[PDB]
Structures are given as structure tokens and as C-alpha cells.
Amino acid sequence: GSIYNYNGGCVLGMSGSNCVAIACDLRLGANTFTTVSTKFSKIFKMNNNVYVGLSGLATDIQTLYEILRYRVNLYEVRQDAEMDVECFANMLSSILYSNRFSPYFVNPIVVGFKLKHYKKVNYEPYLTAYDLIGAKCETRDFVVNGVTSEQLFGMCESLYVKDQDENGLFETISQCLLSALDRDCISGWGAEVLVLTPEKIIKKKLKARMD
Amino acid sequence: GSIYNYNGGCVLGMSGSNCVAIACDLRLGANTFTTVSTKFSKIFKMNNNVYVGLSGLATDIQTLYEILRYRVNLYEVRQDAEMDVECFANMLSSILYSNRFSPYFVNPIVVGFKLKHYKKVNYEPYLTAYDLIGAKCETRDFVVNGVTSEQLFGMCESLYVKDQDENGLFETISQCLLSALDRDCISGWGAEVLVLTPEKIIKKKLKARMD
Amino acid sequence: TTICGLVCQNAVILGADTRATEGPIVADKNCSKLHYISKNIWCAGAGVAGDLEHTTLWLQHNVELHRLNTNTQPRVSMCVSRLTQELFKYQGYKVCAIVLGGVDVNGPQLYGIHPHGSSCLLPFTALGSGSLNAMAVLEAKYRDNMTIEEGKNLVCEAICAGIFNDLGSGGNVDICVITKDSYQHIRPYKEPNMRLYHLPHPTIYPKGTTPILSEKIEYIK
Amino acid sequence: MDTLIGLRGNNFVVLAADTYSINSIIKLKNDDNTKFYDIHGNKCLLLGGSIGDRLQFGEFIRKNVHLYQYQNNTDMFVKSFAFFTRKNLAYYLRRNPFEVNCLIAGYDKKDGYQLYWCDYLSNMDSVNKGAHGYGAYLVSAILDKYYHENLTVDEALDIFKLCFEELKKRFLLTQINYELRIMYDNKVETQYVTV
Amino acid sequence: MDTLIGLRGNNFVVLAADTYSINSIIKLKNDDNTKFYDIHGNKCLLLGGSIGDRLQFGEFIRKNVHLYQYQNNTDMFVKSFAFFTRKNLAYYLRRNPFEVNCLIAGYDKKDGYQLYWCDYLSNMDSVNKGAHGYGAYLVSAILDKYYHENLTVDEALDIFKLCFEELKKRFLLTQINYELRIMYDNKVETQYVTV
Amino acid sequence: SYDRAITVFSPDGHLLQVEHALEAVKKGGCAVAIKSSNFAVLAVEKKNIPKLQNPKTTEKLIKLDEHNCLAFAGLNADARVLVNKTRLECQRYYLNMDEPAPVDYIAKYVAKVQQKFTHRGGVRPFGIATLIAGFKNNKEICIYQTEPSGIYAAWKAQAIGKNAKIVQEFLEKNYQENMEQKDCIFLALKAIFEVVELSSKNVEVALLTEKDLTFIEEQEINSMVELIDQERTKNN
Amino acid sequence: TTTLAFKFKDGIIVAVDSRASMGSFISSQNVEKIIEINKNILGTMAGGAADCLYWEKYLGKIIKIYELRNNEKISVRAASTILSNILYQYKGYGLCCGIILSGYDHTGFNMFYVDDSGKKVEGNLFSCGSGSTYAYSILDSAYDYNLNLDQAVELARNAIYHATFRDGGSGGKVRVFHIHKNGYDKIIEGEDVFDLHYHYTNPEQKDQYVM
Amino acid sequence: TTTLAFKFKDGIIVAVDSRASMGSFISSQNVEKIIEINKNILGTMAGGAADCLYWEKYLGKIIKIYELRNNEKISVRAASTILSNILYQYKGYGLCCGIILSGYDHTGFNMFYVDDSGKKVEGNLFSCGSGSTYAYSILDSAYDYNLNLDQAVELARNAIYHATFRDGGSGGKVRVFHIHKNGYDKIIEGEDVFDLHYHYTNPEQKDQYVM
Ligand SMILES: */C(=C\S(C)(=O)=O)[C@H](Cc1c[nH]c2ccccc12)NC(=O)[C@H](CC(C)C)NC(=O)[C@H](Cc1c[nH]c2ccccc12)NC(=O)CN1CCOCC1
Ligand SMILES: */C(=C\S(C)(=O)=O)[C@H](Cc1c[nH]c2ccccc12)NC(=O)[C@H](CC(C)C)NC(=O)[C@H](Cc1c[nH]c2ccccc12)NC(=O)CN1CCOCC1
Ligand SMILES: */C(=C\S(C)(=O)=O)[C@H](Cc1c[nH]c2ccccc12)NC(=O)[C@H](CC(C)C)NC(=O)[C@H](Cc1c[nH]c2ccccc12)NC(=O)CN1CCOCC1
């Protein structure tokens, strides 16, 4: 717990009607109370339909991201195809458990699209959350992780609305993240929100508190 | 211990033919290796026939000396007579044991003359050594105490000669003290030797090592 | 330390060694470990010397006060009660193992008292670090109704066993024979250890060999 | 403790450190030179921590980067250098950790002037201004307040003078001797400042 | 840590202290005034340690000594003052210890100029020169070397200048601000020295 | 312990113990205190057996702390005990407030102690009246008078002790505001010798200024006494 | 917490933040860290909120009774001494108090820092709390005794803002009071630091500010 | 222990005491703390005597093989680097080593301080051991680069004497060597500090010196 408090940070993920959203706080901390950066993004793109939000110790976040990028790139170059979101989620679970007795201090979420072929292709929102040793929670509405987990859980339980367009989804996720961050000492200093749609990605920086 | 090592210090007492001698090192230490004074005497006169050598923690030495002076002065003013050496030794034992479970960190010796009346008076050398809770060793040749106890015991076992005049007694006690001090890091920086005779006291400072 | 005691016909014989040790160093070569409580009661001590000396002195003077007030003969049972109650009060933090022996109206009596405040009435006992060697001797050779001379020899043998087999024991053998009408304290009784090598001549330092910084002479009047 | 300060502008990078070599309660040297590690191709690693770990890690990184540049007949990018350093520190964190804080400064055409902040836990991020040590608490707000975009080298040096004055006045360790490395106009300059 | 220095001559006593009030990693004041306790009748208690214990013990001793002098219409002797201070410190050592080091200086006709050294354990002795703190390690030998009998006040101040220069140059805490109390010619003078 | 109510109400509503303490005060010596712009002058009667008593030992004019001074009339032992209490309280106030105790505070404390001793069981009232001269926190000189009953009041010039009424009347007749030091000393000496036998060894005078309390020199007292004697002879 | 006070040509400027926290959770953003002990003394509190509030109320009671008895206003030095002695009596119990008492008395304007360990430091400029170092740096870089009231208020506001920006334990609103001979005014009742950030550091509001 | 070295206009002056101790017992007073690594390099050792001696012999073996292979004399910097790397490989095992390597090479006179923690500090003046602070103070108060050989030897002797006088862990004899371009000389083979005290501090020998 102290190791997570060292840096802080929080990630959130929500689903709408034919869209998903992944949000994060932009702070980098030190000694649990010193802010050294305000542009430390915690959302990483694996491919067009897969994003991972990593919160926790910053060094472990960077290490896990490098490992995941390595694995995804090798898989995709070998198969000549984009990696499936479920396959990436299972691979992340197995990688996290491979360090079971000396784990990475990272609490990740996976947000993306599952592609189903029939002619056209159906995009299904996909959300999973993890604990540091790869225990996986597959969800249809929202996933949270980080030191702000309780606040995010409360906000999402109270405010999440099913089957929202991209605009309503963005408003809901931004409000949840901002209200949850306003109650955390070691999280905040800016919020980054990505809204995924099958044809485009909207990246927004929120006017947030910086105290 | 280390509390004795904090300051260091050593006292020695020897008997001759119609004379006694009490010697001490003159150092005051701090943190076991810093010399702050080179004139911290550890021999105190209670009355003409009683001397006490106190080694150990300097604050406890000063406190015990003040208590002993108080007690001896009250006893002597009340009785209108000098306190006997045996009576002082027993009183010191009882005072030390009165703090049995929070003791003074001092290892004392008592050197003096026992007076026997027949006309003339007979002076008998008297030596006792103590542990910090008043256990008493009554001796006829030599008593030692302090962090240099082992070296002093060896030197006195090898070199003590029974029934020596004041000159031989002084030479023997000074040689014992100097040789024992030469092997101790935290004791030395000058030696003070008192030779008691029934008619006079000779006080000498020895040319010792100051390293 | 090796202290021991036994009951023979109409007497109690206590014995002790005479070594006091401060860690591995002999602080006293001829310490006295047998203490007079009353004319008909004595004790032998093992453990922390300061505690033993203080407690034995306190018991002796309280027993003398009781004898003066009651105008009767002191009782080993009274000494046992006082000592055990004190030791229990302090919960073994006064480390005093005592062999208390005396003769009263109930005849010769020997008690072993332990630091926590337990006591036992025994025909013979031994305490200290040499207690196991002394106990070996006593178990081998003890019998009821021994003569005072036989008991003295047995106590000497037990204390010598302790002295020569235990590193915390040494010096001489002190003995005390207590009857209903007198006590005999023999100190030393054996004297079995003496320095074995001496230099051909003692080393006398020539006068003036020690350098001095200053010399102040004062006359005592 | 060793105070390190770093400032990144559009046209420069300035690194600053105290010049004390400390051994217990005595300063071995007032002109210590074991904190800056200059790497060919406009790169600098400023290290703070125990002198032994500082020397070992700094020389290890410098020799590895020089080997890379000789083998490939090319200059390593500043981002590659920073993340290589972070990867090595992270690798050793769980085996035999170096207790060193890093300020990684450099210049390259691809990304211009770059400054990276890294702590002994290997938490790294690119910053415009950073600090390490117990003097960070006293210089970070000065940097925040007086930093602006389009700052010049001389204005940055004035900010550093404010920082040094604050460290002399209010810091428990009255630090008066500083060394500065300035990267700008594709040249690296050394300065010594006493307050 | 607070460095205290004391020098006793045949005609003077000089006490010196650093003027820093320290709270964690920041210096609250560079002109601290909580270490010297001047006592009527040419006495001075120089204390070093935590500011709270320093204030409590210094004021307790000063008020007790002033009460004694008012009640008895007389000046307490320097030896009586020193041993009274030591007795109080020893009394509180085993109950609620003050973690203070003391340099007790004074002048009286009976014994002339007197200096006593006392540590937080209440180990006291009269000395010709003494020091407290981690700067004692760096000033004690200078005092030993340059001290002699029949020294003058100005020569003593030169010795103190050497000590201050050493504490600025070699001590981990670069101490530059010192206060001196000088007792000589039955007058007490205050000086402030910066190196 | 002993807690009998020594001071009780008389049928008429009086405290006879307090009246007797006042009588003990009236059996004491005479003390006068005069205030001026920024200083005070306190004179007190001396009673010494010539050539055998040590004049310096007895002290009715004492100093409590660096700025407060006291004179008293009544029982010397009670005065000594009360003065030691007051000095301890001065230092306690200094320790607790980091400032010297002002004269008004110290006078209030003395009066409170005397009231408490009239109102506690097992004790008898202090048989002394006191004049306390000092400075307030605004550096203003002030004189307070305290009585055995515990009632205190500030004054411009006041006399206590034997024949205090005559001296008070003389002061009311001959007092002026903001006198100089010499004139104030002369007034104090004349007021005290209004009831004390005219002699330079029958009086002790002190002048209290912010700096300290300074006792007037014997030669100056001799000269002033000679001037008073000349004036008396001329008048008669 | 960030509290600061400093003397200047027109009196004393006192400033505080309004954030309270338990661990990493922000318990409140609108607490009052400046209190008035009497008409002419203000105390800024940091550390344990309950300890600070209780002991300031205790000091106020003592000062009220003192003023009623003696018909004079207590001095800042005397109030600081009372508070420090009381706090020292509890040394070793776990009290967490850092108080700056600033006020006007007969000896001009006075400022004392008092701690739970019994410290009492007289000074011209103090700062306390977890943001004290940042506030100190900002104040020292731009302090001057001849600042006007507006300049002094601006300096205090800027220092509090920077402390909140860099420290995770400080935030909420900034309050600035001015102590003058006749009492005290509240120049800034409470100002959200959200506006301060986008006034000072990111006026353009066209991108996320990079620290 | 007190070891010191400093550069001056005619080379390097190296000085040491001769005392060894285990705890508070002086094990020897005639140990040799200056060793020659090769013809032109002297190492002064402090700390664990066994560790220092073994690792100095190891360094000597390495330097001998290097010089045999390359037909050139090794530099002080290279020797210091070898020693520091070797010592660092054992960090966390309990080695106690402080070594000053002073020598002459093709780049002039060079002096490095090497520790068991892997430190390597180039310098002009170093001191090591428990008396290092006293030696440092004495050297700093009277150091000059333009001292003659006799003046430099006197300064080193005085510094060692004062270190022995103030520190209980230093004593015995003082050795002073001079490193010059063509090798090294032993100016003072070993001089008892007894005479040094009674020549510097108590020349009169009329009374016990008061520190
Ligand atoms: C028997 C040994 S044993 C192993 O069985 O405990 C002896 C019994 C003994 C010694 N002297 C007397 C006198 C009267 C009666 C009995 C006696 N016990 C000891 O010798 C003790 C054994 C240790 C393990 C407790 N030794 C002591 O008590 C030491 C005596 C001593 C030390 N320095 C001295 C100088 C002069 C005279 C006597 C002594 N004392 C200590 O060990 C001190 N500690 C300090 C902490 O509190 C406990 C005592
Ligand atoms: C400054 C921060 S700091 C890091 O410098 O100590 C603030 C100063 C402060 C906060 N609130 C006030 C009010 C008045 C004056 C000054 C004030 N200090 C704090 O916020 C405290 C920091 C800890 C580390 C000491 N926090 C607290 O004291 C908590 C306040 C609190 C708790 N619940 C709340 C609900 C609403 C409003 C406030 C609070 N309380 C605690 O943490 C203390 N207990 C300990 C036992 O478990 C319960 C909390
Ligand atoms: C300097 C002192 S210091 C405080 O600054 O460390 C000296 C330097 C020194 C001593 N001897 C030599 C020889 C060559 C070079 C340098 C030398 N250091 C010491 O004296 C050591 C201090 C301790 C605190 C590290 N002491 C030792 O290393 C002991 C030497 C020794 C032991 N017995 C001896 C007999 C004769 C001569 C010398 C010695 N050794 C130890 O303490 C090692 N212990 C011994 C006990 O068992 C565990 C290991």
C-alpha cells in the first residue's frame, strides 16, 4: 500500500453505445506528496482496438509497458494481424502472474473493442481490470484502478448510465474522474480522457485542479 | 558495560608497612574515545584516614561523592569524632545497595587506616573494593577497579611485594598503574598517586603518556 | 560458588568455597560465603554477592531483634519464613540461593531456599555452580547419623569436588558446625590452592625509577 | 545530501549541482567532480547519492553509451540514452540497487533540448524543470515561479542564482559552491558559482 | 547540531556558538538567540541541543539563580552555579532528561575566570578550553595547539577565527554565523562574527 | 492536620484576629514611600543598639526583583516569610510569561496571600503592612500599600507603621507632583522624622529608578538631617 | 498544510491554505487554519487539527482571564511562552502542533513560532506545514520590508499558491489576513487555487501545463 | 588511527600513527600503517587492519603483473580505480578500509582516497582514521603549498601528535615519509609521542597539564 502511495495515480474505463472511454490522472509523485511532473500519462495504446491503463509504481508501469509492447509487436508481426483484445487481456494476466512472488506493483485496466465478423464487422466494448498478480475482472459498464479506487467506484456506481453516445460517455467519465480526483491528495494535476469509436479516437485534456 | 566505556577511568590501591597508597588516572572521556579533560581526579578524601577512589560514569562519581561527603560530615559532626574506615566501608556498601535496581554506575575502592587504641595508637592499612551494588571485597595487599581492572590485576599479581616502606610502595603502585594504563585506550592522560602515612600524605603527579 | 550443607547427629555442617567471580575474572579470592544469622543459625549463599550480603545482614539483625523482644531462642523456621517471603516479594530478582542450617527445639534443620522464594527441608543439599559436583559427592557418600568428624570430612570432599571441577569455584574450604549450644566456624578449613611458581627474587624497583611531574607533601595533624 | 537542479528551455539545458564530497561529518572537498558525467554527442548524466554508487553507475553508463556510439559510428539519441539509463537502473533495483538520483540532459536534432528526471526507484519522466535532494524542497517552487517559455540562458542563470541564494540562506546545509553545465548552441560549457 | 566553543584564560573567558535555529531541513533563523543565558553577577550558561529543552532548562536555571541572588542579596559563585546546574541536570537525567550540553562560564573574585564543560549525561569538569557538537571534533585540536597561558583577548579571538574558518571549510554543516560572549575586565561584551 | 478556624467572625461582624494583626503592625516601625515622575523614594526607621548591633543585618527595605522594592512594618519574621514568597512569585511570573512581574501584579499577589491567610483554617494572619514600589508594563512608576486584612490600594505618598497618621497628614500637607530626586528625599526624611527622633542613624532611605534601587549615602542623610534640624531650630 | 506569516512596513501578513486530510484522503477543503486568540493576536495552526484547535482555545481562555484580572492586553511573547510551556508539559505524548502567533502589542508587531516540542522562536517571517519549504522559497526570493499592502498580499497569495501546487497535502482555498495596530482585516476571505493556477501558470488554457 | 597525506611544492608528505586496538584494549603500539605498493606509490591504511593489509597486497600483485606485462609503471589513478572496484564488489560484506594512495607518475604527484564503499576521491590533502578530524583541523589551520620539506614534516608531525592527544584510538609512534619524483624517504622512522607531548604542550614538566 505504501508502495502505491509513493506515486499515486488512477485509471478509469467506461463503455457506451459503440464506444469506450479510458481516463487517467496525469500526475507523477515522489514520497507520496511531492509532485515532480504533471504530464505523466498512464494510458498506452497497444493497437487500434486495445488500450491499457497502468497505475502504480512508475518504474513498474514503464517496465510492464515495455514488456507488453514487445509481446504485442512480436505477436502481430508473426501473425500478420492485430492482436485480439481478449487475447491481450489473457496475456497480460499470465505476464502479471509470472512474477507472482515478486510482482510488479501495477494495477492495470484494459479497454478496447472486440471485433466480430459476420461483410461488416461488429465492435463490442471490452473492459477488464486486474490486480497485481493477474486476477481479472471482466466488466460491461466500468472498470477502475489506482489509489482513488474507492472514490471512482462510488462515482461510477452512482452516475454510470448504460448505452450512451460518445458525448454523454465523455461527460460521464470526465465527471466521475474529476469528482474522484478532487478527494485524493496524491492523484490529479490534470486528467487525460480518450474516447474510442470504431472510426476515430478523441483525445481531450480536462481543465482540472492542480493542488 | 558500555556505560563504563563511555568515560573510562581506573583506580588502584595498595598497602605497605605502616602506609597505604591510592592511585588513579586523570582522564575524562566522552563517547569512549574523546578526551575532554586531563585533570579529572577520581580520589576523594573523606577524612584524614579515609580515601575513596571512584571510577565509572563521571556524573555518578560526582553524585556518589556528594552523598558520601554529606553522610560522613553529618556522622562526624554528630559524634564529634572522625568516622572509622570500616564504618565508612559498610555505609558505602549500604548506600550502593540502596539503589539496587537502578544503580550508580560506579566501581569504588576504599583505602585508609584502621586506628587501634591500647597511650599510642596503631595504624593498620585497610583496603576494600566494591561492585556497583555494594558487594565488598576486603583485602590486605591491593584492590583495583575500573575498565583497566584486568591489566591492574595482572600487574599487581606479578609485582606486589608485601611490607614495603613508603618509597617502595610508591614505586610499585606507580609502576603497576603506568603499565596497566599503557594498554588501555580509554584510560590514562596522567596519573595521580597519594601515599598515606600516619603523619603525612605525599601527593605526586606522574609523568605519564598522553596519547 | 560451591556451598553445601548436611545434617549429622545433633549438628548441622555447612561448607563453602571462597571465590567471587566477575565474568571470567576472579574479583575476590577469599570471600566469605558463610554468614552468622544467630548463635544457632548460619547460612551459605550463592548467586549475586551484593544481594546475598544485604539479605543475610538484614535477616541477622531482624532475627536478633526478634530474639531480644521474645527472650527466646531463634528458630530456623522463622528465618525460612522471613527469607522466603522477602524473596517472593522480589520475584527472583534478588538472586539468592541459600543453604540455611541451624539447631533449635525441633533439632537440627537444613533448608534450601531458592531466589523465587521456595524452600525445602533437606538432610543434605548443595547450591552454586559447583552444586552438581558437590551433589555427586554427597549422594555417593551421605548416610544418616554420621559423626561430626565424618560430616566435616564429607563436606570438605564435596566442596573440594566443586572447587576442582567448576571454573566458578575456587579458593579455600570454609566450614561451620552448628549445634544447639555452640558454633565452630573454621575459615580456612582446607587451603587446597596456592600459587605454585615464584620468581627467585621479588622485583624491587630502584628508587627514583618512576618519573614524576610534581610532588606536594602535606602533614596530617 | 546532494542537491541537483535542472532547467530545460527551448534553446538550452542547464544542470547544476553542489560541489561537495562528503564523508561523515567532514567535507572531503569543496570542489567535488564526481557528479557530472559528460557523454560525447551532447549528453550529460548528473548523479546524486553515495559516492561509490555514483561512480560505479555513472562510469558504467558512460562506457556503455560510448561503446554503443563507437560500434554504430553514430550519436545515441537523448531519449534512447535516458531510457537506457532507466532500464539499467530498474534492472539493478531488484538485485543490487544503486542509490542514485539522475538528471539526464541532452540535445539532438530529432527532439531538441531534453531533460529527464529519474529517482533512485527508477521513476523517470521528461520535465521542463526538476530537482533532487533535500534542496529540491527549497528550489522547486522558485523554478516553477520564475520559469517561462522563451526564457534565455542568462535569465535561466538568474533563476539558478535565486536557487543558490535560497539554498545558502534557508537550507540546513549551507551550500555555497555549485557547478553548472550549460548546453546551448551545440556547445557545452562549464561554470563554477559561489554564493 | 549546535557547535559551542569555550576558552578560559588568566584574564578572560570567551564563549562562542553558531547562531542557527534549525527546524528539520530548514534554518528558521540565521541569528538565533536561544543558546546564551546571561546571569547577573558575571555568569553565562551556553546551551546546545533541541530548542525546547534548551529553552526550558536555560530559563529554569536562570530564574533559580536569580531567585537565589535576590533572596540572599549576593552574587552566586561561579563554582556554586556550575555545580548547581550539574546537580539539576543529573536529577532530571533519570526522570525526564534534558538533552542539552552546557558550557558554564563566569568570573568571581574567589576563583577568577572559570569555565566548566558539561554534557547531556551531566559529566562536568572545569577546563581551560572545551567544545560541544560535531564541530568539537574540528575545533578541539585548534584550541589545544594555539592555546597558551598568558594569552590575551585578541589572541583568543584569533584562535576563534581559526576555529570558525575550520567549521566553514571542513564541517559538513557550513556554519558561517557565530555569536561570542567575552568576559574580561569585569564587563561582558557581545560580538557577532561572520566568515 | 490542624485546621481550626483561627480567624472567625465576632458577634458585631468583625475579625478580631485581623484587628490584632493591625495592632501588631501599629507596634512596628515607620515606613514612608513617595512617588515622583519616574522614580520613588522609600524611607524607613532604624532601631539599633549603638556599638553592639550590626546596622547592616536588619533590612526593612528589600528588593523583590530587578524592578520591584518593598518596605514593611510589623513582625519581622512574618515579613521575611512573606517577602520570600513574593520573590519566588516574581521569578515564577518571569518564567511563565517571559516578562518581569509588574508592580500591580505583585501587590495583588501579596494582598491575595494575606487574605488567604485570614481565610484558611489552621493559620493566623500575617502581622505586617507593606509598601511596594515598582513599574508597570507601560514603564510607569507606582506605589501600592497592602494591609493585614488583605486590602490593597495604590498611592501617591503613603506612610505605614507606628504613628502612621501623623506622617500621612504631613504628606498630604507637603506633597507635590513631579518633584526632583533631592526634594523628594528631603520630603521623605521630613515626613519620617515627623515621628522618628531626628538622627542620621535612625533612618534608611532608598531611591528606586528604572535602573535599580540605590540606598542614599550616610553623608547625604547627615546633611539633610542637619538641614531639617536647622529648620526646626529656626521655627522654634 | 501551508501557513505563513511575515512582518512588513504596515504590519503583519498572515496566509493559509484550507485543506485537511487523513492519510491520502482529502477530508475537507474549507477548514479555517487562521484563528483569533484575542483582538490583537492571530494564530495560524498546522499539524494535528484537533490538538491545535484545543490548545488554541485553552490559550484563549487563559488570556481572557489574564486580561480581565489585569486590565491590560497580553503580549504576543507572553502568549507564546504560555503556549510553549503547556505544550512542553506534554512532550512525549504524540501532540502535533505548529503554531505561528502574530500580533500587535505595546512593543510593536511580534511574531513567534511555537511547536509541540516546546520551541519558541521569535522572528520576522515564518512558514509551517508540509508546504512550508515551497512557501519559504517563494517568500525569500521576493521578500522586502518596504512592500505596500497590495504587494505584500500578492506575495503571500503567490507563496500559498506555489505551495499548494507542489505539495499534495495543501490546497483548497487561500486566506490572507492583515494585522495592523488597530486589529486585523481579512483581505482574502477565501480564494480557490483553481483560478490561481490558470491566472499564474497557465493563463492561455490551450494545453495541459508541463511541470 | 590517524593517517594523513598532503601535496606540497616538493612532493607529498605522508604520516601515520602506530596504534592498533581491539575494543578498548591496545593490542599493539608499533604497527606499520604506511606500506609501499610499488616503487612510486605509498598506501596509508585505516580501519580493519586485516582487510587493509590483504587488499593492499592484492593490489600490489595486480600492479606487479601489469607492470611486467606492459613495461611501464602504473599510475596512481589506475591503482586507485582497481582498488575501488575490487572493494565495491564486496559492498555489504563488512569490509573496513580507508586507504590513501599517494604517488608519483607521469602526470606528477597524485593522491586518491579510496573507501570500502567504492569511493575514489582525487585530492591534495586527505586524512583518515578516528583522529582524522583533529588532523584535518591542524592541517587546515596551517597548510601552505610552498612549505619547505622541514616545515611540511613539522606540520605533519604536529597534526599526528594532536590527533593522538585528543583521540583515544591513536597513539604509539608517529611516522612521516616524503614522496618525491625519484621514490620516497622515511624522514621519521618512528617517534614516540611521549616526547612530542612533553616538547609541544608541557615543556616545563612542573605540573600536570590541564587540557
Ligand atoms: C557464587 C557463584 S554463582 C556462579 O553460583 O553465582 C558467588 C557467591 C558469592 C560471591 N561472593 C559472595 C559473598 C557472600 C556470599 C556469597 C558470595 N557469586 C558470585 O561471585 C557472583 C556471580 C555472578 C554470576 C552474579 N558475582 C558477583 O556477584 C560479582 C561480585 C563482584 C564483582 N566485582 C566485585 C568487586 C569487589 C567485590 C565483589 C565483586 N558482582 C557482579 O557480577 C555485579 N553484578 C552487577 C549487576 O547486578 C548483579 C551483580
Ligand atoms: C495540515 C497539514 S500537515 C501535513 O502540515 O500536518 C493540516 C492542518 C489542518 C487541517 N485541518 C485543520 C483545522 C484547523 C487548523 C488546522 C488544520 N493538518 C491536517 O489536515 C492533519 C494532518 C495529519 C497528518 C496530522 N489531519 C488531521 O488532523 C485530520 C483532520 C480530519 C480528519 N477527518 C476529518 C473530517 C473533516 C475535516 C477534517 C478531518 N485528522 C486526523 O487524521 C487525526 N485522526 C487520527 C485518528 O484517526 C482519525 C483522524
Ligand atoms: C585504526 C583505527 S580506526 C578506529 O580508525 O579503525 C587502526 C589501523 C590499523 C591498526 N593496525 C594496522 C595494521 C596495518 C595497517 C593499519 C592498521 N585500526 C585498528 O586498529 C582496528 C580497529 C577496529 C575498530 C576495526 N583494529 C583491528 O583491526 C584489530 C587489530 C588487532 C587485533 N589483535 C591484534 C594483536 C596485535 C596487533 C593488532 C591486533 N583487529 C580486530 O579488531 C579484528 N577482530 C579481532 C577480534 O576478533 C574479531 C576480529
Side-chain angles (χ1 to χ4, degrees), chain H residues 3 18 52 60 76 177 187:
Chain H
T3 74
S18 318
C52 286
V76 189
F177 298 0
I187 313 301

Side-chain angles (χ1 to χ4, degrees), chain E residues 72 146 186 194:
Chain E
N72 304 118
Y146 294 100
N186 90 345
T194 287

